[PDB]
Amino acid sequence: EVQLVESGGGLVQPGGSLRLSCAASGYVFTDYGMNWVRQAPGKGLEWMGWINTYIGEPIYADSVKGRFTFSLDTSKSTAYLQMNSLRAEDTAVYYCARGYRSYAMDYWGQGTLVTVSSASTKGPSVFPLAPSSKSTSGGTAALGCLVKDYFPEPVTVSWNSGALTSGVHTFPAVLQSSGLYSLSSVVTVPSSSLGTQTYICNVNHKPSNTKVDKKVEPKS
Amino acid sequence: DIQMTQSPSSLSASVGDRVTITCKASQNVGTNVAWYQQKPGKAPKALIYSASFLYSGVPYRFSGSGSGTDFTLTISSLQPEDFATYYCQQYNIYPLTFGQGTKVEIKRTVAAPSVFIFPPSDEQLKSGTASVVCLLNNFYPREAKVQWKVDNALQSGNSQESVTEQDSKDSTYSLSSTLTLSKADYEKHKVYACEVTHQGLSSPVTKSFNRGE
């Protein structure tokens, strides 16, 4: 199947540059061009330009012409977006999207978040949200992980290395007055499983290279 | 540039409803219009090209119509998984431009939240801070009020809320409210209480604990 995988995003200082990569598979890379589109948090989609993948000729939206540039490595079936002299306003999710010149975009990459900030990266602390000792016998219990004080977004959270997906809610992060993010991830399970089934939240904060497995159990 | 204007900005409809959203172009764009579906945290998915043709794999309940300046997207029988923001886009001429999107929410029967409260862990307390978490799970509609009291003192300004996006299967929401205090402050008080008000509750539900018990 057609797949577009973006990387190279993350934290960058104001005035700095990043070079995003969009690695394509599952089709002949040079049979379609590539678009770049961005989406600032909570806002709409903004087309930045298109590149001819057969000869490497780029077309830019006037808004980013000169400051952003497109390039290729056909031998790697990869398109790049170098974004320069960045400012806070450039903070956004950046997508590559396959397509012909002046046409619809039929496949999109997963998107990569670029955060333009002078603040330093910070990995999360992970604390248990321990299931209540008053959980209903034969009933349902809630437990979770508090993933606190990290920067920038994003963090990923899974449970039991992905074996546990049913009943999971990983909340949108909230920016604290400290300038750091925090979220909880919770899951509901049978009360009867508490103390028997192991529950581990797997937290990965790539910008700080912080991976934590936190076991959550009833408190004694 | 060509401006694309979508209406309404958001709509709510029940499972099985037929739903139509509109997109107006500021200039003639022929039928050079596409529609995309974007679910929370995901990349847009292409639904429709040349105003009315479905991409392969797209469910038949999606359709599109129009030419010139007036375009529509229709869902013939809304499903819970159709919760998304829908975007139109013209490619009559560069630069490609998008509408601001229409957020489609699923209307369903009222569902009361299940409420849970979590004291701070001893681990966190060692770092000098206490977070107290109140969880409202799987409720509808989204409107809910959470009130924090510490030894009967109303807490204002030291909590933050986060709400999940509507669930793609049961169309409910969940919500966390997190109260933050210093370790010193936490240890000066006994009763920590979260009071929840919601349409599905005949009267407010309070979950509470006494510190150390």
Author numbering:
A (entry chain H): 1 to 220
B (entry chain L): 1 to 213
From the paper:
Among them, TNFα is a major inflammatory cytokine with a crucial role in the pathogenesis of inflammatory autoimmune diseases via interactions with its cognate receptors, TNFR1 and TNFR2. TNFα is a trimeric transmembrane protein; it can be cleaved to release a soluble trimer. Certolizumab pegol has a unique structure compared to those of the other approved therapeutic antibodies against TNFα. It is a monovalent Fab fragment of a humanized anti-TNFα antibody and lacks the Fc region.
The crystal structure of the uncomplexed certolizumab Fab fragment was also determined and refined to a resolution of 1.95 Å with R/RFree = 0.147/0.179. The certolizumab Fab presented a canonical immunoglobulin fold and four intramolecular disulfide bonds in the structures of both its uncomplexed form and its TNFα-bound form, as expected. The electron density of the structure of the uncomplexed Fab fragment was clear throughout the entire structure, including in the complementary-determining regions (CDRs). Additionally, all CDRs of the structure of the uncomplexed certolizumab Fab fragment had the same conformation as those of this antibody in complex with TNFα, implying that this antibody drug maintains the CDRs in productive binding conformations prior to interactions with TNFα, thereby contributing to the high binding affinity to TNFα. The elbow angle of the certolizumab Fab fragment, defined as the angle subtended by the two pseudo-dyad axes relating the variable and constant domains of the Fab fragment, did not differ between the TNFα-bound and the free certolizumab, despite the intrinsic flexibility of the Fab elbow.
